[PDB]
Amino acid sequence: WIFHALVFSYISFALISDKRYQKKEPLISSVHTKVKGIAEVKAEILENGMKKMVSGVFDTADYTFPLQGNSFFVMTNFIKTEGQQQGLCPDFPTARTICSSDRGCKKGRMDPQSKGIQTGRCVVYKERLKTCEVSAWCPIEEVKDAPRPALLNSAENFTVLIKNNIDFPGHNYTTRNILPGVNITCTFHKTQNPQCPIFRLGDIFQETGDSFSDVAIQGGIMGIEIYWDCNLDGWFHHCRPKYSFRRLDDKTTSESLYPGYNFRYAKYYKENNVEKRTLIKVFGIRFDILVFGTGGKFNVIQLAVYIGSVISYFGLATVF
């Protein structure tokens, strides 16, 4: 007769723990995001073999772009190339572009590691280096690694405020991340205050265990996660978020592939009756906010189906 109560205890345990008497629903979410703070750049670069001093300040109009859905981007490093006009010009001398005769490169060949189409005229470029000119923006963007000291090493001191508004369309529930009458002068910390939305980039990066400086060379993809586990019943009602973070970039890289998250960005300007761009190579840690959650109620149909399913165990106990 011991199993006659043991089965009951097991069904009670499962019903209380898994919340089978609750009908779960999607989440529907909208994310609002503000990145604040400024950075200051003062350093030295080697462009085209010539030393130059980069000094200045970048504010909220410089180190980001208008919000792209549930995400936001932050400048981290850049390579600048000014005054590029369409024409024919030798490209950057690499292993696949060096030539000693015009026959070395064929006109119209589009090696998937260049910018432009070659014409097949191996001319000198610099220090008697023979390469065959391509039709593209001149001067051709020299292929070089990002500077070892990240230009925006101060970017880890930035702050970000996140407002999440989730919905449960099955029920009549729509709720926000920040409750009214709550202090905003604060910072996020798992133990000190896990409800404050203000996240510190240094903090989010150090919690995962990755040093910001290392990853600032080429950037990466970061994710914040907001989990919502909301009980909509009149009793034991609570709907509150939990914050976690992790790296969506592989971090292991590969010889064929390339680490970081980088892209090239264009800025056109006509001058002297000529057209010329100012494209920049851009390394920047794109953030992806990932918000997900569940919410149940007391729909009696689920309760009935589960009770009727578990009644057979009551039967079987007497059967055996």
Place this chain on the structure above:
Amino acid sequence: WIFHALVFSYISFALISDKRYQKKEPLISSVHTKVKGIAEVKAEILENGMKKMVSGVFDTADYTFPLQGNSFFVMTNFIKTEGQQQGLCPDFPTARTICSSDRGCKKGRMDPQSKGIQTGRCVVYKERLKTCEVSAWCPIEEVKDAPRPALLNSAENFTVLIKNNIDFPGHNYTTRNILPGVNITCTFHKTQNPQCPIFRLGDIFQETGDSFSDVAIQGGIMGIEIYWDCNLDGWFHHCRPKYSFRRLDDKTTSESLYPGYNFRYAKYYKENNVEKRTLIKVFGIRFDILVFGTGGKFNVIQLAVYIGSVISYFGLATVF
């Protein structure tokens, strides 16, 4: 014996209503959006305490930006500051920036309400107002409220067409929002025509019950919801959307936080061998389309499971 039939009536009621014999599947959607119409601006502004006249016309290339996933943005108000070059200049005189001696502000101090880094030299700025210059774009954007009559008050007269294409990967179903052969010369109205996808911004704003002019000062976050509840069975087949709207912005605000949905945008231009931007403070009502729905079929496993579950009530009625 009355319960013997009452149970049967309950189970039938539950099966017909909740559609337990239907295996539900999530939704995969793609949103296409077009915002049309033009606006005209003719007003007066007080910039740097000088009166100026702003007159002109904004068209689809001006009052928006390229679509960002399942969303679209509309210009509502802006504050323009032209000709800003990098250099050291006094900032806007506020409570936290006013000084009487160089000792009042320390060099390198980055108060999180400023643009640029002070050097510690409290000089006059205007009307014998001593503030200490910071290194940033000059002249420093003066902190001012948006004008009381919203520059684009005509923006409520714009129209938006929405094409939703949803998928149900579990089944072989992919459908669209607009059926072929359906008039497009129309406007949305819950009673007149709830299938026409052309929404009027004044209409969507007024349905929720918020006046456009008040929210147009600082903007906010709007959301359209498209609910799909599609029955894929041969019999009683129907798959049609329903439109609803609501405000994802808090609308209650806070003294620490700030209402509306605003951001600063940059437009760079080199002139006289100097670099200068034209950054604009932007207030604009970001729209977020939220599309969700369910679709099921006649998978017999679900039917078998439910019927076996509910058989225990038939037996318990005889038990009791």
Place this chain on the structure above:
Amino acid sequence: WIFHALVFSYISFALISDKRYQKKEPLISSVHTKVKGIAEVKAEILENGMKKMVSGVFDTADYTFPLQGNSFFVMTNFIKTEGQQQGLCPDFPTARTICSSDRGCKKGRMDPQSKGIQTGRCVVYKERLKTCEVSAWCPIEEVKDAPRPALLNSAENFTVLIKNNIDFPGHNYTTRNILPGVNITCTFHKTQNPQCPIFRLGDIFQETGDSFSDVAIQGGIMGIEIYWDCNLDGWFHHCRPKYSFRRLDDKTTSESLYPGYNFRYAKYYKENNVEKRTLIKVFGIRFDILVFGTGGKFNVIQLAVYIGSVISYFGLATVF
């Protein structure tokens, strides 16, 4: 007694096939995308009745825009209009804009096919064609169809590399699209190599059965689908993606509506103390990556619920 074993066979078949003993979880994904390759343009255009030669090269900074969430865009065709200053000028002569007297058009009338607000002065525009000037950017963008040979017909030769990182927050599982130690020098093909993420635009368009050249006139919306069906149990563990493609654009169009996916893009520049833009009409096939998947485990509660549900059939077989 045959049914006594037939029922057991059916329950075993259902449990093995549908995987009822697995608790399914949603998917949380992040998409990284790279589009590579270059294009060359050399053609002739008829702008304002005058022949011109368009020759040049477009690289990764020209034929796209920064990634917008889980999507990417590719230039396909464009109509350029340079030097547009704000002022009053006659618009493009169409059926609704031609007038013979000033009374034909009323000042302040905003026909929803125009750019600018008319003033009601029917003056000559070209070849003794009388239209009434509107206040907008001049010269008014002439309404013309895209060139019959698509300018970027070579865009089908582009390659795209996709890195998908999905999560199963219910379990402790986060995985990537590309496994380590896997060749990247390859191309996608359903039979040759369905794991290589490098997709060829000509390939993706031809698999669906749509010629690239025809859709390149006005563009369209393309969709890649990545299906993940991952078994997280220790035995029979596998978690691998499958690639499919389809057209989210209607492709049937309508007289009232308009085919393709086009938008107008703005590029401002101040010159001669005047403001002027360089807005371009843009036709480009927007790509929408759609990633979805399921993953289950061996939660015993689901197993117990299903077994209890199906025990009733064991009972009913003896009942009948």
